[PDB]
Amino acid sequence: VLRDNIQGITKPAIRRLARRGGVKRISGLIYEETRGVLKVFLENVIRDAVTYTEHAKRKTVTAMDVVYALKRQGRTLYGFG
Amino acid sequence: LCSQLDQLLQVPERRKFGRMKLLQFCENHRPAYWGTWNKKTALIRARDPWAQDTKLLDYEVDSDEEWEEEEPGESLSHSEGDDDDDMGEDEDEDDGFFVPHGYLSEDEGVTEECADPENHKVRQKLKAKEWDEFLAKGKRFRVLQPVKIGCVWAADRDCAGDDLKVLQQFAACFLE
Amino acid sequence: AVEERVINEEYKIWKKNTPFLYDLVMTHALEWPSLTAQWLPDVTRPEGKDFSIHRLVLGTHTSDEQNHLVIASVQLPNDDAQFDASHYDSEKGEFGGFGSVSGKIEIEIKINHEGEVNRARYMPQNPCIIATKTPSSDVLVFDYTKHPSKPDPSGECNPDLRLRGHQKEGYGLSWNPNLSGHLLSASDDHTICLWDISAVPKEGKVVDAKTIFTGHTAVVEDVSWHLLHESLFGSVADDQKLMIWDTRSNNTSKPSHSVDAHTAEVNCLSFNPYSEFILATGSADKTVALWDLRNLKLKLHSFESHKDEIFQVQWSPHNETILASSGTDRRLNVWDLSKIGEEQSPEDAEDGPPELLFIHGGHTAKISDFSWNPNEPWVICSVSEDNIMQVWQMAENIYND
Amino acid sequence: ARTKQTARKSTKKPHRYRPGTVALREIRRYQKSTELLIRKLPFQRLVREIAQDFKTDLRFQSSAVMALQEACEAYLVGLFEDTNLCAIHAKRVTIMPKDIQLARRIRGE
Amino acid sequence: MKVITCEIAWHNKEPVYSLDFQHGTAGRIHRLASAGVDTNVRIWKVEKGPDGKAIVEFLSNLARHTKAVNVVRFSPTGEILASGGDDAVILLWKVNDAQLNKENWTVVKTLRGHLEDVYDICWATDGNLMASASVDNTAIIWDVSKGQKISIFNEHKSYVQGVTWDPLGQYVATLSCDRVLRVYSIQKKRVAFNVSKMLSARSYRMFHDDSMKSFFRRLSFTPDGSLLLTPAGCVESGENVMNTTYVFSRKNLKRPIAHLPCPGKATLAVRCCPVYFELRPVVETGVELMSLPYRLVFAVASEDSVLLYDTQQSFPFGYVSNIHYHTLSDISWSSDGAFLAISSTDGYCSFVTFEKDELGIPLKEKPVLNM
C-alpha cells in the first residue's frame, strides 16, 4: 500500500524546476532520472540526519540535524543556520 | 512658449572589454547568446552593415550545427505547463508534522525537568515566533544598512544622547 | 522566389554581422502581424532580480480570425547585470557564454477586437485607458483593468466606450499629453474628428463627435497633438499638405495655417518631446522634411535616405535631436541633428548623406510600427508584416563614440 | 492607398574565483525564496516512507521538512546550471541524462 | 575604532568558521588563518594601510583536507598551527624554509582521537598540551611533543562546542550542548566542577538547549585566568528566558559572579584579548566586573553582534551590529590587540581597526601567572 509514491513527483513541479534553472528544451525520459537523483540525495541527507539525531540521543529530528547533514555532504543553508 | 510659437507661426578587465552584449532570435534552435564583443574591423560599419568581414569570421550558418534539436523537447518555451496545477487532500493524524503536534510528540517522547506550565508557555512562545515569522515573510527582500556605535565612555558627557540611551538599553544586570 | 531568396540571404548576412553592430537584439515571431506597437511608461524592477520588465500594446491582423488587442510584458536584463564577469571562452577570447537564462516576451491580456486594430494609443496619463481604431466606422476604447485578462469566449468584442463622428476606417489616432480625454482621429472620410472622453459618464458607451475638421481635400493620413501646446495640433494627408489647426479657432473648416508638404503624399508627423518648434513629416517621395514652426514656408531640412515611401516617423524621449523613420524599404534609419552640415569622405558617402547615423534592415517584411522606449534609451521594438517582432538596440559606440 | 499582402500562417569545471577582486553581493541568494513550487504532500509522504524504511518511532517538524525541501531544489538548481554549462560545452541544447551524470561527477558525488 | 567589512574573496564564498592571529610576533604585521568548508586553509597577511584601514592579502593555502574544517587556532607561540576538519583528524603544521602560495606550510604532527567532525580545539598555556572538541561528545587530551592521545572524557550526553585551557594550567572547562557545564582538573583528570541548573528559589538551567540555531558555543579563559566566561546563557527573569553570558571567578565556579544579558540575538563565541591595560580612571563603584590591578578587554560574539567590555565597565563600550548578513562564526584578537578579526557564516569576514592607545596603555611588564 504505502510503497508506490516514486512518481509522486509531479510533471508540473519538474517542469517548474526546469523553468527556474533557465532551460527551454527538456528530455522526456529525464524525469525519472531526476526523481532518482532526488531520491538518492534525499536518502543520503535523511540517513545522515538520523545519524546525528541518534548521536544526539534524540527521537524527533530537528532541522539542525538537517543543517549538519547539509554541511557534511557539503552545501550551505541560508537564513536558518 | 505657446504665445511665441503662435506669433512666429503666423581574466582581463571588464572595463577593458566594454559593455555586455546580448542577442536572441526566436527562430533559432540555437540558444540565445550573451557575450562581450571586442573585435575591431573597419569593414563592418553602420553605413554598410552587410559588407564582407574578411579575416574576421565565416559567413556560414552555425545555428543548425549548434542545435539540431530533432527531439521531444515538449515545447517548454511557452503556452503549456505553467498554468497547470493539481490539488489534493491528505491525512495528518498518525504522525503529526505540525508545530503543536510536533511539540506534543517531543514532550511525550522526551521528558525533562521542566514544569508543565513552563512547557505550555514555551510552546506558546515558539508558536508565536513561528506566526510572526510567517507574517514577516511578506517583507521579502529588505536592503539592510550597517550600524556602528563608536567608543562612547562615561567620562564624556558631550556625546550623542541617542547613542547613550541605546547603550543604556543594553545594561548589564547584576544579581545579588 | 528570387525576391524571397535575396531577402533571406540579406537577413542571413545581417544575422551574421549583427554582433559587431548591435548591443541588444530580442526577436520574436508573432502569431499574427500587428499594425500597432507601443511601450508602457511603467517599468517593473523587482528587488533581488537581475532584470527589468517592460510592457507592450499590440494588435493582430487576422484575415478570418477574431482580432485580439494584446498586451505583452517583456523581460529585460538589468543595468547592474550589464556588468558581470561570469566566464571566459579561450576560443573567442571574450567573456562570452551562450547560456540559457535570458529575458523573455510574454503576452499578458488579449481583448477581442472588431476587425484589425488600425491604430492603438493610450492615455499619456493613464495606461489603463487605450484607444483603438477599427476597420468599421466605430472607434473602441478598452481597459485591461476593466476587462478579464483572457479574451472573452464570445467572439464579439466588449468595448468600454465607442466614439462617433467618422464614417469609415482610418489610420490616424492621437492623444493630448496636456489635456485629458482629447482624441484626434483621421479617416478616409476626409474628416478629422476631435473627441473628449473626460466628460463621458461612467455608464456611457457612445461618444459623439465633439469637433470635425474638413479642411483637407484628401485622405487625412495622420493627426497628432502638440507635445507642449495645449491647443495646437497638426495634420498630414494624401494631398501633400501640412496643415495646422488651433482648437481655439472658431472655424473647423478654415485651418490656422496651410503649407504644402512635398510633391508626394505624406503619411505621419512627429514633434520633439523636448522642443516645440520643430516637427518631422515623412512623405512618399523618399524624403523626410524638417519644418521649423517659426517659418513653415521653408523646410528646415529634407533628409533623403529611403528608396520608397516612408510610413512612420518618431522622435526620442531620451534625446532631443534624434529621429528615425521606417517605411516599405524594411529599413529603419536613425538620424541625428548633430551631424547636419558635416563634411564626410565619399567612402562614408556612397550609402547616402551623413545626416544618417544608423540603418536597421532586420525586417523580412515591411516595418509595420515602432516606438522608442521612454525609460530605456536607444531601446526600440519594431514589427514587420510577417508577424515578426524584435526588440533591438544598436552598438553604443555608434552614438556615444 | 497602399498595396497590402495576405499574411502567411506562422508555425575549469570548478569555477572557483580568485581570492582578490571578488566583491559579489548577491542578496537574493541569502534569503529563502518562500517559493516552494513543489507539492508539499507527495514530498512529505515520500520522506515519511523512506524514514520508516530507515528507522521507526520517530517524528519530524514542519520546519525540518521544509528545510529538506529547499535543500532539494537548491541542489537541483546547482546541478541544473551545471548541466546547462556542460551541454553548452557539449555543443547541444537538449538535455541528456548523461549530462546530469557528468555534472554530478564534476562535483564528485 | 573603525569597522571594515571584508568584501574580498575569503573562501570563494564558502562560509568562515574559525580564525586566529599570530601570538608569537608582537610586530604590527600579522599572519591570519581561516576555516571554511572549501576544505581549504588560507593564510592571509594583514596590516593597517596608510589610511589606517586593515588591508589584507593572501599568503598560503592548505588543501589536504578531505572534509570541511571548523576550528583553527595557532599555538601561543604561533609557530605551529592546529588544523581541524570534518574528516575526524587534526594535523599540526609549521612553515617550511606554489604559484599562488608565497610560502609552504607543512604538516608536522598527525593527531587523531576524535573519529567524528570536530568543533573546537584548545592550546595549553605553553602550546605543548592540546585540547579539542568534536561531535563525538568526547573530551580528549593530547601531548604536542609526542603527538599521541593521553586522556578521554566521556561524561557528556550531547555535543560539546567549546573547550578552553586554564592559563594557570589547573583547569579545563568544557560545555555540553545539553545546557551542562563541566570543569576538569589537570592532575585529577576528572570533573572538578559541573553546573547545569541554578536556584534563584526556583531552579532552572542557565544555558540554551539544542533548539538554538547556532552551530558553535565557543568561549575562552581570561588570559589572567581568574575570570571564566560562558556564552549562550539563559536568564528567566519572568515567565520568559533571555539570552546572556555568565562570568565566573576562581572563587566559585558554581555560582557565576554575574551575567551580561544580550537582548535579541544569542551569544555563541567568547574571546579575550591577550594584552593587558592600565586601570582606566573611573569612580570607585561596583560597575567593574572584577577589581584587578591591571585591566583587560575582551570581545563577545553573539548571533549577529559583537560587543566590547573591559575590566572596569559593565555596559559595553564598543558596540557593532548589522554588518554580516548571516550569523557570526568566529572572533579573533590580534597579538597587539589592534586588529579584531570578525568572521561570520555569510561567507565574508570583517575587521575593526584599533588605534594605538585607544584601549589604554599596555602594561610595560606583563604580570606573571602563578602555575
From Swiss-Prot, chain A:
The modification N6-(beta-hydroxybutyryl)lysine is found at K11, K57, K71. The modification Phosphothreonine is found at T60. The modification N6-succinyllysine is found at K11, K57, K59, K71. The modification Phosphotyrosine is found at Y31, Y68. The modification N6-acetyllysine is found at K11, K71. There is a cross-link at K11 (Glycyl lysine isopeptide (Lys-Gly) (interchain with G-Cter in UFM1)). One of its GO terms (cellular component) is nucleoplasm. It is found in: Nucleus; Chromosome. The modification N6-propionyllysine is found at K11, K24, K57, K59, K71. This is Histone H4. It comes from Homo sapiens (Human).
Swiss-Prot record, chain B:
Residues 105-141 are annotated as: Necessary for homodimerization and competence for chromatin assembly. Residues 62-102 are annotated as: Disordered. It is found in: Nucleus. Signal peptide: none annotated. Residues 62-73, 81-96 have a biased composition (Acidic residues). It comes from the Eukaryota. Contains one Pro-Xaa-Val-Xaa-Leu (PxVxL) motif, which is required for interaction with chromoshadow domains. This motif requires additional residues -7, -6, +4 and +5 of the central Val which contact the chromoshadow domain. Homodimer. Part of the CAF-1 complex that contains RBBP4, CHAF1B and CHAF1A. CHAF1A binds directly to CHAF1B. Only minor amounts of RBBP4 are complexed with CHAF1A and CHAF1B in G1 phase. Interacts with PCNA; the interaction is direct. Interacts (via the PxVxL motif) with CBX5; the interaction is direct. Interacts with MBD1. Interacts with histones H3.1, H3.2 and H3.1t. Belongs to the CHAF1A family. Acts as a component of the histone chaperone complex chromatin assembly factor 1 (CAF-1), which assembles histone octamers onto DNA during replication and repair. CAF-1 performs the first step of the nucleosome assembly process, bringing newly synthesized histones H3 and H4 to replicating DNA; histones H2A/H2B can bind to this chromatin precursor subsequent to DNA replication to complete the histone octamer. It may play a role in heterochromatin maintenance in proliferating cells by bringing newly synthesized cbx proteins to heterochromatic DNA replication foci.
From Swiss-Prot, chain D:
The modification 5-glutamyl serotonin is found at Q5. Signal peptide: none annotated. The modification Allysine is found at K4. The modification N6-(2-hydroxyisobutyryl)lysine is found at K4, K9, K12, K32, K40, K55, K98. One of its GO terms (cellular component) is nucleosome. The modification N6-methyllysine is found at K4, K9, K12, K13, K32, K40, K55, K98. The keyword Protein biosynthesis does not apply. The modification N6-(beta-hydroxybutyryl)lysine is found at K4, K9, K32, K55, K98. The keyword Lipoprotein applies. The modification Phosphotyrosine is found at Y17. Its main location: nucleus. It is found in: Nucleus; Chromosome. SUPFAM superfamilies: Histone-fold. The modification 5-glutamyl dopamine is found at Q5. Gene3D superfamilies: Histone, subunit A. GO terms for biological process: chromatin organization; epigenetic regulation of gene expression; gene expression; nucleosome assembly; telomere organization. It holds the Pfam family Histone. The modification N6-crotonyllysine is found at K4, K9, K32. The modification N6-glutaryllysine is found at K32, K55, K91, K98. The modification Citrulline is found at R2, R8. Acetylation is generally linked to gene activation. Acetylation on Lys-9 (H3K9ac) impairs methylation at Arg-8 (H3R8me2s). Acetylation at Lys-98 (H3K122ac) by EP300/p300 plays a central role in chromatin structure: localizes at the surface of the histone octamer and stimulates transcription, possibly by promoting nucleosome instability. Symmetric dimethylation at Arg-8 (H3R8me2s) by PRMT5 is linked to gene repression. Asymmetric dimethylation at Arg-2 (H3R2me2a) by PRMT6 is linked to gene repression and is mutually exclusive with H3 Lys-4 methylation (H3K4me2 and H3K4me3). H3R2me2a is present at the 3' of genes regardless of their transcription state and is enriched on inactive promoters, while it is absent on active promoters. This is Histone H3.1. The gene is H3C1.
From Swiss-Prot, chain E:
GO terms for cellular component: CAF-1 complex; chromatin; cytoplasm; nucleoplasm; nucleus; protein-containing complex. WD repeats lie at residues 11-54, 64-97, 113-152, 155-194, 207-258, 278-319, 323-364. The keyword Transmembrane helix does not apply. GO terms for molecular function: chromatin binding; histone binding; unfolded protein binding. It is found in: Nucleus; Cytoplasm. One of its GO terms (biological process) is DNA repair. Keywords: Acetylation, Cell cycle, Chaperone, Chromatin regulator, Cytoplasm, DNA damage, DNA repair, DNA replication, Nucleus, Phosphoprotein, Repeat, WD repeat. Differentially phosphorylated during cell cycle. During mitosis the p60 subunit of inactive CAF-1 is hyperphosphorylated and displaced into the cytosol. Progressivly dephosphorylated from G1 to S and G2 phase. Phosphorylated p60 is recruited to chromatin undergoing DNA repair after UV irradiation in G1, S or G2 phases. It comes from the Eukaryota. Subunit of the CAF-1 complex that contains RBBP4, CHAF1B and CHAF1A. CHAF1A binds directly to CHAF1B. Only minor amounts of RBBP4 are complexed with CHAF1A and CHAF1B in G1 phase. In G2 and S phase also monomeric CHAF1B is detected. Interacts with histones H3.1, H3.2 and H3.1t. Belongs to the WD repeat HIR1 family. This is Chromatin assembly factor 1 subunit B. It comes from Homo sapiens. The chain holds residues 1 to 392 of 559 of the full protein.
